[PDB]
Every structure is written in C-alpha cells, then in structure tokens.
Amino acid sequence: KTVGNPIGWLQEMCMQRRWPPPSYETETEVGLPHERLFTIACSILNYREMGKGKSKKIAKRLAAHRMWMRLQETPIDRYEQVSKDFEFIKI
Amino acid sequence: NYDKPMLVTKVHRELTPLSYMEKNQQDKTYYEFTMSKYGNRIGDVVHKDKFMIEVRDLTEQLTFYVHNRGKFNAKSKAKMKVILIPELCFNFNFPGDL
Amino acid sequence: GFLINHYYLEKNLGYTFKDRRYLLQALTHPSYPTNRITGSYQELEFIGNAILDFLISAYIFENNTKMNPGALTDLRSALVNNTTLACICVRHRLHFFILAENAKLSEIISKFVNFQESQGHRVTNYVNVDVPKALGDVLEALIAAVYLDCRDLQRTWEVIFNLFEPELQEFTRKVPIN
Amino acid sequence: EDVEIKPRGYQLRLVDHLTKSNGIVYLPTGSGKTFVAILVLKRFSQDFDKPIESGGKRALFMCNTVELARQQAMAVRRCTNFKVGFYVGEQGVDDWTRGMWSDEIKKNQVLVGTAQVFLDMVTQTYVALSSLSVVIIDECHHGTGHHPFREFMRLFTIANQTKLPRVVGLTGVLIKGNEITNVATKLKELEITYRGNIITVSDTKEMENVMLYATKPTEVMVSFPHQEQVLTVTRLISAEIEKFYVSLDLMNIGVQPIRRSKSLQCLRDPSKKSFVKQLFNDFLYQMKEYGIYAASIAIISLIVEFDIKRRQAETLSVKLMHRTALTLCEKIRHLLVQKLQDMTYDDDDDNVNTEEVIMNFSTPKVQRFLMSLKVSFADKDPKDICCLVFVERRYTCKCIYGLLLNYIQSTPELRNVLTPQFMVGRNNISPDFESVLERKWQKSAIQQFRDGNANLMICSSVLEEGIDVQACNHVFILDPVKTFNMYVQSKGRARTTEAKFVLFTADKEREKTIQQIYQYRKAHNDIAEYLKDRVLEKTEPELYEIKGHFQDDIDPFTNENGAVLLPNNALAILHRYCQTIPTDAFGFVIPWFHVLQEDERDRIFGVSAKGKHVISINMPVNCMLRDTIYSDPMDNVKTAKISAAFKACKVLYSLGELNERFVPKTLKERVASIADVHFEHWNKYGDSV
Amino acid sequence: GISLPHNVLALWRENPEFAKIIGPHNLRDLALGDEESLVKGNCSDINYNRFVEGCRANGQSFYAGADFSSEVNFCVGLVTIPNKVIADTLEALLGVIV
RNA sequence: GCUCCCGGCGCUUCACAGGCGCUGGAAAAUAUUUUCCAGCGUCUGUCGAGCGGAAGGAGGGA
C-alpha cells in the first residue's frame, strides 16, 4: 500500500512544520550475506518508528512510511492440493 | 488421481448420498467423505438425493496365456466395494460387456 | 622468538650453540610458513645424513672387527635406518621443537610418540603404526647443525655417540636381520 | 534413395565462404553444424600428408569440454579417412617431451582436444601457428574474458601475420549471458575476438533445408500455485541445523589452511566446515522448495555423502566432525520419516498410499510436475518416450531422481514406461543411496540414456551444452530459466518433430517469466535481422581494432626461443612449480598472497600508487625466491594478483627454474645440464648418464 | 487393420542398404496427425523428408554401426529365431506325424 | 585436495543522470503564484568495487 515515495513525504511533513529533519539510524545487520536483513531506525523529535527490510533501501523506505502514517494517526500441516484441470498454456 | 476407466455393475436406487458407509465408516457418509477428500476439486455435489452407482475395476493386462497363480485373498479383494456418485464420474456410452 | 624452551633442547641434545640460526634451519619443516629468514631442514639434513652415516661406519669399522663384513653392513644399515633415527629423536624429546604447521603430520607424530612411550622409548621390532620421516630428517638436520656450528668432527662425533650409545651397545650384541 | 549424406547448398556456400575468408558459422545445433565443420576440415587437407619439416601443415579441432572433444574426435574419425588424435589432461600431457610430441603430430593429421591442452601446446613451441592449416572452434560463445579460447586468439596477435591459420567458429548460440540488449556491439566484439565475421543461412530454400534437421518445438507453460506457509517439522529441523552450526563453529579441528575471499579482504571458514555448511544449506533449500518427501530423499543423499567423507577422512578430529554431521542427518531423517508415517490411517493399500503421501507431502510445484508427467506418459511405449528434466541445483537432480523412482514404483500406469536417470557436472555426486563401498553397475547415466535403457533424464545444465543426445520429444524445465543461452539450447534439445517444451513457473512470477521469454525471443529476432541486413565488403575486422581489443590486459612475455608466457597463465604456472618443489607428502604449501595496506603501499611505492592496488606474494620457504615479489600498481585486485604471478614467473625463469619454455624444470633436465661437466668420461664408453 | 505408413514401408523394404539404419529413435520422428493416420495413409512430404534425413544422419552420430533390429523388426515383419528352435520344430513336426 | 575460467542471482559501498520534497537566497506577477540558484534528504536508472550462495568448464597433482 506504499504507492509512492514514503520518505520524501516524511521529510515533507517534518520540515514544513519547522520540525527537525528526520534522522536515520542503521541499527542491526543480521543474516547470511545472501539473505542479510537490515534494520533502519528513524527518529523525529520524540517519535521513532522501526524499519525492517531485506536491504537498507527498502528497510529505510518502510521505516519512513511507518513514521509517515504514524504522523497522521497521532497528530497448516498440509500442502494445499492442486486441481487436475490444469492445461498447457501456449507462450 | 486414478483416471483409469472402470465398469459399473449395478446402480443403487434405494441408496443416496449422505448415507452411512456400510463398513468401518458408519459415522462417515458418502457426501461428507467426498467433500473431505476432494472438495477443493469438485466444489459441491449436485443432485444430492438421487441414486448412486457401484463400479468394479478392470484388469490392466493384455496377455492372458499364462495362469495368474497367486494368493489373491478373494474375500479381501472383494472387500473394497466401490460406491460412486453418478454425476462426479464421467460416463461413456460404451457398453461394459463389449 | 622462534626458539622456545631453548635451554631444554640444548640440554637434551648435548650441544650448546654459538650461532642459533643453524638450529632454526634444522627445526624448520618446509610446511612452516612464518619462518622467512632461513630455509627448511632439507639442505641441512642432506649433509647430516652423509655425516652421520660416515661417522657411524667409521666407528663400526674401527671397533667391530670381530664380525664379518656382511654383519657390519647390516649393522650400518640398521643404525642409520629412518626408524632408528625416529626412536632416537623421540627418546630425546626433540619432536617438541619441530616447526611445522601440518595437521596430519602432527597427528602422526603424536601417535608415534604415544606408541614409543608405550614401549618406554625402546627400539621395538623395526618400529603397525606409521613412522614419520620428519623425525629422522630433523635429527639428521640437527646433527649437521652441530657440525656446521662447531666445525669439528670430533665434537660432532661426541654428540652422535651420546645420542646413539644405547642403540650402539644393543645393536653390537645382536644384529637385526629382516 | 541412398545412405551416404550429400552436402547441401547452404553447407557448400558456407564452406566456400570460409575457405577464402575466416569467420564464424551460426547454425542451430544438430547434424548440419558438425557436417559443415567436417567439410571445412576436409577442404584444408592439402598439406596433411607432408611432414612439418617439408612445409606440411595440420588441422586443429579444439573444443570446450573433454567429452565434446572425444565426441567430435570419434565423429571425424568415423566420417573422414584421416587419422585423428585425442589429447586431454587425462592423458598426462604435461610431462610430454619434445620428441614424443613431434612424432605425435607426425602421426595424426587432425588433433582434437580441450582448449587448455592446445594452449599449452602452442605456448611451449611444440608447434607453431604456421604449422596448422585450419583451427576449428566449436561453442565459440565461450571465448570471452579470460577463457582459454580468448587466450588462444590472443596468441594470434604475437605470431607471424602472413602465416596464420584459418579460424572457424561453430556455435548454436552467440550470446552467453543476459546481455541481450544492444546485440550489435556484442556481436561485433565476438567477431573481433576471432578474425572473421558471422555468416548464417539467408535464402528461404536454405532455411527450409536447414529446417530438415533443426526443429522449433512448441513451448508451453504449466502454472502452479505458489504458497509461503511452511510446516512445523521444517521449523524444528531448521532450529536443529542452527544449533549444529553453533556447535560446529567451535568444533576445533586440527590446524587448517587459511581461506579468504576471492579478492582477499574477508576471511573464510575452513573448507572442511564450509563443505558441511553448504550441504546442510542445500538440504534446507530443497526442503523449502520441493517438500517433505524430497527432504526425506535428500537427507539420505546427505547421509551417503557424509559417510563417504568420513571414510575418506584422515584425521581423527575430521572423523569426529563427520560423525556428528551423520548423527544430525540421521536425526533429521528420523523426524522426516515420523512426519511421513502419520498419514497411514487413511487406508491399507500401500501402492496407492505411496502415491497419496507423495502427492500430500510435496509442494504444488512437485505435485503439478508429477501430474504433468502422468498425463504426458500415461500408457505410452517406453521406446517411444525420451525426455529430459532440467533442474538448477546438483542435489536436486538426485532428490528428484529418488522421488521419481518411488512415484514410478507407486502408480500402475507409469510403472513400466519410465526409467529415471540423472547426472551432474564436475564434482560428481555419488549415484547410490545406500553408501555401499562398491557397486557392480558400470554403465554411465548418459550411456544408458543413449542406449534407450533409461528414457527419463534429470540433469542440471550439463546436457544443455556439448554432449550429443538423441532427439527428445519432451523437455521439462522444472526450475526457472535464467540465461538466454540456456533457454535457446534447451529449446534446441527438443529436436524431434512436434516435440513439446514445458516451462514450470509459479503464479506470482508468470508475468516476469513471460516478459523474460519475450526478451529472449526479441533478442533472437534482432540477432537474425542484424545478421540479415548488414553488408560488408571487407568481411574481416581490421588490424587496429583487433589490437585495441587485447591491449587492455598485460602484455605477454616471449623469449628468444619463441615461447610465450601468458600473464593469465602465470598463476597456473606458478602453482604448478610450487607443486613439483616439495619432496614430501606434507611439504605442499601454496604461495601466500598478501594485499598491502595503505600505509605500506605508500611507504613502498612513493606517491605513484594512490588509488591503485598492489599485491605482495610470499614464496614458500623451500624455493629460491624470498624477496616478496611486489606487483605493479593496478586498478583492481585481480589485475594486481595476475601481475604478481607474472613477475614471479619471470623472475623464476631468470633464475633458471623454468626450462626456457615456462614449464618447471624436471629432474632429467637438471641432470642433463650437469652431465657434460660431471660425467664427461662416460662418453668414451658409449654411455651417458 | 493398422500398419506403418505406406511410403516409409516402401522405402524400408525396397532399400536393403537403408534398412539397417532405421532405429527406434528415428521412428519417434513419425508423429502423424489424424488426417495422415486415417485418410491419407502415409506421412506428408515434410515428415518423410525429415525422417529420411534423420536416418541418413544416423550414420555420422554415435548410432553408427548400431543394431536396431531387436526393437524395429516387428514393424516390418522380420523376426530372429535361433537355429536350435528350427531344428526342434522340425523334430516336433516329425513327432506329431509319428 | 588445490588453482583457474565463464555466466546468472541476491545484498553492501562509491561515481553519473533525472525526478520528488522542502529550507534559504535572487527575480517577476497578484499573504499568494511563478522563474533561477545553493543546501539537505529521498525516489528511478546507469557505470565501478566488494561480499555471498548456486550452475557449468578446465588443468596441474596423488
């Protein structure tokens, strides 16, 4: 549901209001090198939202999205079986 | 998953879905067993109060010269009586005896 | 810095060195990577083999005049055998100072020294456990190191006789024939 | 109404074009591509009989892999009257001397072998490029970067220009990777790497004649749903493997060689532990991808592999580590078997129970694959079906092979139609699930598939390239296609009429895989049209661009004898030399490569090495070099390492350790260099040392 | 009521030098449609040319010199019998006459 | 066992290109809009370098 640039909007809502610019902090880098999961934190005055992503890119983006809509809110046991009606679709 | 053709022997007018299985599944009906096994594949059963059928499997061999000697356990072989809902099985117009 | 328990090794060997780099070359296995100031022991062992063989042959020729030349050459081959050198090296605890970085070689040396301790440092029958050539080669290397440091075949002979006295005495009473 | 095959019009046209001017022939894989090679081989056979000393010449057929070399050697042997030789690293070519190479070339008219063998052949002055009438390159798309084909082509820039051989490139696909965009520059670079332009069939009748041996099989898509939820037993096994990794990180095996990253910034775990970690990670991947039954087969494969490694282990600590790994694998297998057995309450008929548990304990990918396999080979003739299954990972081949064995001996209709078989590339996997010390089965998987004993092949990109396989009606690409050449060549594998090409992709990646296939097809069309409209009178690249293509790398070194030391071969030669120096089993130590720090680099090289990387190499203690040869300041680490190896080899040659051919001196040359001074008196008695 | 296509049969029987190279893998190229298998009676020109070219190319691949008779003999009516069976059937005819 | 080669995938760090978001400065127009410039952060793409798993190939050597 993050259709656009959430952190551009985040900086927008912050420093229209003469609020301090959003600070970004890279907290943890966990996992194997081929599956590293990165943790970016965003702090804006007393509010801080967490960002998890497979890359620092998407982690920071999602952290800023959390900051952004938080700024607005607060002003099996079984593999599923497959049907047999499958066909060979031409490509 | 067993797509082999089979032969229908008799149809049971008195029988109908939602009827209790005669052996080992008295608490299990044909209708609910069919759902619990292939509901995502069949969706639903239509014509629920009509008759059903009884089918028997055909041999897959094509050479009948040598005697098929073995301990078949004929009673155990006949134990698995197969009762099928008609509209869930594809029906040929081909006679079975032929 | 390379030489730890220096006095221990010098006391067991029976020689005190004036120039320690010969000892470093003697104890340097080719697999040891961090020694970049002096070559391995193969050069030293090449000379030491001939020196030890000649000295042993000279002693057995001078003293063992009773036995026939066939027994003399059998005794010579037995005294300079790599197995005998390995037992002598283990008995004097010279394997503690070998500079090597091979896991398989270290395990082989440990197994052989355990087996030797099981026999009480006694030369058994030509020994079911493999014998590493490293012990014999390093022993020959320190022999050549003594020779090069002292430049005196008499002192080298004193060292070799001090090392070989039990084996010399035992092998002069019975000849190991295989 | 005849048996012998006559050359076609397009083949004759290609041969006539090749004889006057060199180039690359781009034809679909099959009999035409090798027939044209045989024809151009025959056309350059004027000077085969005459010896080299009398102005004779030879023909060189250099391949990519040993099996393709043997294959083409047998083909040319059985199709031509020439006598051909087979020269690969398995023949022990390294210890071959001057005289017995000379009689070897004297014997055979055509030399067939791998690229590296002929590269070291030429670089050691065993033959000259003037001594080869024509050279044949098949699978020329491999000749990029530092591949031996490109080094062999680089050798052409040093030898005499007026006495160069004829270069011919055989390929079924021109592009190797995914650089499908901007075809023109890629094709120009490929043509510049060799010394000719690409030629292909143009007339409609020519295309139709080509069509008689190639095929465009129908390609179809088999969608299966993709789900993310996982079983609890998978979580338990993952936790067990994580705990075992924690325990193994402090296993404390004996001292091991230091392993580092490819560019030497970052440290590595010891190779022995990395092997175990790789095996368990591969097993985890297969468990996540194919299902619980697949994990049950893969854990048996891991049991066999760990048992083999423990048997081959030499140290007690290594045996203990492998015993712990085997204990984990047995525990995992027991857990998987327990999970499988908690379904038998459904019925008692085991024949259908096996099929039902297989279909219930596999991901929708495997279930759809099995349904497609059943509906495609329901009740057909085993002699009539011949199909390949392509998967990515090596262990996926074995796992799917075992699962397919069980499924085949689980369903009545597929019981007597399909005989599965599998093979993988180098670092072969044990094809046995019981870890028996020795088996009496000797027929190779590819030989069984060729002979018709097995009709179902599960291969991992091995059969995409090189090996000849009879025309296959069905080709199942179970794993997603990754490269353009893989797609093209797997599509060309289904070479029979009306053949079926099957793609297995999940629902969420349907758009992306359709777009990828569309880009592949459009790349093929641009290749065709670029080869179509382009016209050139010179039809050969000029000298200036050929020189500019190769000047980026380090200039090679040649001595007065003509031997050439290729900088890309310098590291191989140096490691070869460090191999013959030790005189003991435990005396092997490879050179220590060290990357100099900023302060060290400044202190050594002044202000002339800012922004550049330098590599210092420490030769082992035994060797004569103890001067810590320093590489020149280069842009990246790989060039620095190559320069360091090159300087080390040059300084070794100046020291006489290379016998004026940049191959390490053997004992015989060392004693021959001393016979004339120490054994001079032997001559009067008719003997030499 | 069914047999191989007429054209390929004519090529197979009327060419002894060409009959030793047709194998099971070559027969896979003969995938005729409904029209060819039902009304036409023989493979089309393109299919015939492709099959002939594949059979010719058999002589240069790894299949050269192979013996495909054991798997393609039944197509043309040939069969291989041991000489012992021939002697034994002569003796069996003698025995029944006796 | 070691070394090398080819390709693809995933992340990390540098350079370039464009967009966005605004702060400030200069200008025009009627607190408002527009134009130019600087700064910060980001979004999209490209070029380098590095890390990691996976596939294939070769060679030397026992």
PDB file of N, CA and C in Angstrom, chain D residues 312-348:
ATOM      1  N   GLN D 312      36.794 -41.155   3.811  1.00  0.00           N
ATOM      2  CA  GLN D 312      37.987 -40.570   3.211  1.00  0.00           C
ATOM      3  C   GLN D 312      38.775 -39.700   4.181  1.00  0.00           C
ATOM      4  N   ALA D 313      38.232 -39.421   5.362  1.00  0.00           N
ATOM      5  CA  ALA D 313      38.909 -38.549   6.311  1.00  0.00           C
ATOM      6  C   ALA D 313      40.184 -39.198   6.835  1.00  0.00           C
ATOM      7  N   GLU D 314      41.198 -38.365   7.069  1.00  0.00           N
ATOM      8  CA  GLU D 314      42.492 -38.830   7.550  1.00  0.00           C
ATOM      9  C   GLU D 314      42.744 -38.512   9.016  1.00  0.00           C
ATOM     10  N   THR D 315      42.204 -37.408   9.521  1.00  0.00           N
ATOM     11  CA  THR D 315      42.416 -37.005  10.901  1.00  0.00           C
ATOM     12  C   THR D 315      41.249 -37.454  11.771  1.00  0.00           C
ATOM     13  N   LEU D 316      41.552 -37.747  13.037  1.00  0.00           N
ATOM     14  CA  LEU D 316      40.515 -38.198  13.960  1.00  0.00           C
ATOM     15  C   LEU D 316      39.491 -37.103  14.224  1.00  0.00           C
ATOM     16  N   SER D 317      39.936 -35.846  14.290  1.00  0.00           N
ATOM     17  CA  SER D 317      39.002 -34.748  14.513  1.00  0.00           C
ATOM     18  C   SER D 317      38.036 -34.597  13.344  1.00  0.00           C
ATOM     19  N   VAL D 318      38.529 -34.767  12.116  1.00  0.00           N
ATOM     20  CA  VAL D 318      37.655 -34.712  10.949  1.00  0.00           C
ATOM     21  C   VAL D 318      36.634 -35.841  10.996  1.00  0.00           C
ATOM     22  N   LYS D 319      37.068 -37.040  11.390  1.00  0.00           N
ATOM     23  CA  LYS D 319      36.136 -38.153  11.522  1.00  0.00           C
ATOM     24  C   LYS D 319      35.090 -37.869  12.590  1.00  0.00           C
ATOM     25  N   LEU D 320      35.491 -37.239  13.696  1.00  0.00           N
ATOM     26  CA  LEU D 320      34.524 -36.881  14.729  1.00  0.00           C
ATOM     27  C   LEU D 320      33.516 -35.860  14.213  1.00  0.00           C
ATOM     28  N   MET D 321      33.988 -34.869  13.454  1.00  0.00           N
ATOM     29  CA  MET D 321      33.084 -33.874  12.886  1.00  0.00           C
ATOM     30  C   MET D 321      32.084 -34.525  11.938  1.00  0.00           C
ATOM     31  N   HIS D 322      32.565 -35.424  11.079  1.00  0.00           N
ATOM     32  CA  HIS D 322      31.661 -36.111  10.166  1.00  0.00           C
ATOM     33  C   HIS D 322      30.716 -37.050  10.905  1.00  0.00           C
ATOM     34  N   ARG D 323      31.158 -37.633  12.020  1.00  0.00           N
ATOM     35  CA  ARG D 323      30.261 -38.451  12.830  1.00  0.00           C
ATOM     36  C   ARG D 323      29.143 -37.608  13.428  1.00  0.00           C
ATOM     37  N   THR D 324      29.473 -36.407  13.907  1.00  0.00           N
ATOM     38  CA  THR D 324      28.437 -35.510  14.412  1.00  0.00           C
ATOM     39  C   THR D 324      27.470 -35.109  13.302  1.00  0.00           C
ATOM     40  N   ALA D 325      28.002 -34.833  12.109  1.00  0.00           N
ATOM     41  CA  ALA D 325      27.139 -34.499  10.979  1.00  0.00           C
ATOM     42  C   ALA D 325      26.222 -35.664  10.622  1.00  0.00           C
ATOM     43  N   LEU D 326      26.753 -36.887  10.644  1.00  0.00           N
ATOM     44  CA  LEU D 326      25.936 -38.060  10.358  1.00  0.00           C
ATOM     45  C   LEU D 326      24.866 -38.254  11.422  1.00  0.00           C
ATOM     46  N   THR D 327      25.196 -37.965  12.682  1.00  0.00           N
ATOM     47  CA  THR D 327      24.195 -38.044  13.739  1.00  0.00           C
ATOM     48  C   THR D 327      23.063 -37.056  13.491  1.00  0.00           C
ATOM     49  N   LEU D 328      23.403 -35.821  13.113  1.00  0.00           N
ATOM     50  CA  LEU D 328      22.363 -34.855  12.771  1.00  0.00           C
ATOM     51  C   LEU D 328      21.522 -35.328  11.595  1.00  0.00           C
ATOM     52  N   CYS D 329      22.169 -35.853  10.554  1.00  0.00           N
ATOM     53  CA  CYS D 329      21.425 -36.282   9.375  1.00  0.00           C
ATOM     54  C   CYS D 329      20.493 -37.438   9.706  1.00  0.00           C
ATOM     55  N   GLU D 330      20.946 -38.368  10.547  1.00  0.00           N
ATOM     56  CA  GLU D 330      20.082 -39.463  10.970  1.00  0.00           C
ATOM     57  C   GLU D 330      18.903 -38.954  11.787  1.00  0.00           C
ATOM     58  N   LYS D 331      19.140 -37.990  12.681  1.00  0.00           N
ATOM     59  CA  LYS D 331      18.034 -37.427  13.451  1.00  0.00           C
ATOM     60  C   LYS D 331      17.020 -36.742  12.539  1.00  0.00           C
ATOM     61  N   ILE D 332      17.507 -35.984  11.554  1.00  0.00           N
ATOM     62  CA  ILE D 332      16.614 -35.302  10.620  1.00  0.00           C
ATOM     63  C   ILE D 332      15.813 -36.316   9.815  1.00  0.00           C
ATOM     64  N   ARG D 333      16.473 -37.377   9.347  1.00  0.00           N
ATOM     65  CA  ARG D 333      15.776 -38.409   8.590  1.00  0.00           C
ATOM     66  C   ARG D 333      14.712 -39.087   9.438  1.00  0.00           C
ATOM     67  N   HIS D 334      15.028 -39.364  10.703  1.00  0.00           N
ATOM     68  CA  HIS D 334      14.053 -39.991  11.586  1.00  0.00           C
ATOM     69  C   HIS D 334      12.847 -39.084  11.794  1.00  0.00           C
ATOM     70  N   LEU D 335      13.087 -37.782  11.968  1.00  0.00           N
ATOM     71  CA  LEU D 335      11.980 -36.841  12.120  1.00  0.00           C
ATOM     72  C   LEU D 335      11.117 -36.794  10.863  1.00  0.00           C
ATOM     73  N   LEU D 336      11.756 -36.763   9.691  1.00  0.00           N
ATOM     74  CA  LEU D 336      11.003 -36.718   8.439  1.00  0.00           C
ATOM     75  C   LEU D 336      10.189 -37.989   8.236  1.00  0.00           C
ATOM     76  N   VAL D 337      10.770 -39.145   8.559  1.00  0.00           N
ATOM     77  CA  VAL D 337      10.044 -40.403   8.431  1.00  0.00           C
ATOM     78  C   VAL D 337       8.861 -40.430   9.388  1.00  0.00           C
ATOM     79  N   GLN D 338       9.057 -39.946  10.619  1.00  0.00           N
ATOM     80  CA  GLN D 338       7.940 -39.855  11.553  1.00  0.00           C
ATOM     81  C   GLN D 338       6.830 -38.980  10.994  1.00  0.00           C
ATOM     82  N   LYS D 339       7.187 -37.836  10.411  1.00  0.00           N
ATOM     83  CA  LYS D 339       6.168 -36.963   9.836  1.00  0.00           C
ATOM     84  C   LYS D 339       5.440 -37.650   8.687  1.00  0.00           C
ATOM     85  N   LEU D 340       6.172 -38.397   7.858  1.00  0.00           N
ATOM     86  CA  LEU D 340       5.546 -39.097   6.739  1.00  0.00           C
ATOM     87  C   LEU D 340       4.583 -40.175   7.221  1.00  0.00           C
ATOM     88  N   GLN D 341       4.957 -40.907   8.273  1.00  0.00           N
ATOM     89  CA  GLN D 341       4.169 -42.063   8.687  1.00  0.00           C
ATOM     90  C   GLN D 341       2.851 -41.682   9.345  1.00  0.00           C
ATOM     91  N   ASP D 342       2.690 -40.435   9.784  1.00  0.00           N
ATOM     92  CA  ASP D 342       1.437 -40.046  10.419  1.00  0.00           C
ATOM     93  C   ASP D 342       0.377 -39.678   9.391  1.00  0.00           C
ATOM     94  N   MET D 343       0.228 -40.523   8.376  1.00  0.00           N
ATOM     95  CA  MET D 343      -0.889 -40.447   7.441  1.00  0.00           C
ATOM     96  C   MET D 343      -1.508 -41.797   7.109  1.00  0.00           C
ATOM     97  N   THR D 344      -0.913 -42.909   7.541  1.00  0.00           N
ATOM     98  CA  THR D 344      -1.309 -44.241   7.105  1.00  0.00           C
ATOM     99  C   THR D 344      -2.685 -44.646   7.618  1.00  0.00           C
ATOM    100  N   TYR D 345      -3.318 -43.789   8.420  1.00  0.00           N
ATOM    101  CA  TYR D 345      -4.662 -44.068   8.910  1.00  0.00           C
ATOM    102  C   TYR D 345      -5.719 -43.987   7.816  1.00  0.00           C
ATOM    103  N   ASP D 346      -5.369 -43.475   6.634  1.00  0.00           N
ATOM    104  CA  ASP D 346      -6.357 -43.308   5.572  1.00  0.00           C
ATOM    105  C   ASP D 346      -6.811 -44.654   5.017  1.00  0.00           C
ATOM    106  N   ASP D 347      -5.866 -45.530   4.687  1.00  0.00           N
ATOM    107  CA  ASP D 347      -6.187 -46.805   4.060  1.00  0.00           C
ATOM    108  C   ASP D 347      -5.023 -47.764   4.280  1.00  0.00           C
ATOM    109  N   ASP D 348      -5.173 -48.981   3.755  1.00  0.00           N
ATOM    110  CA  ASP D 348      -4.166 -50.022   3.912  1.00  0.00           C
ATOM    111  C   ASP D 348      -3.437 -50.362   2.620  1.00  0.00           C
TER     112      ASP D 348
END
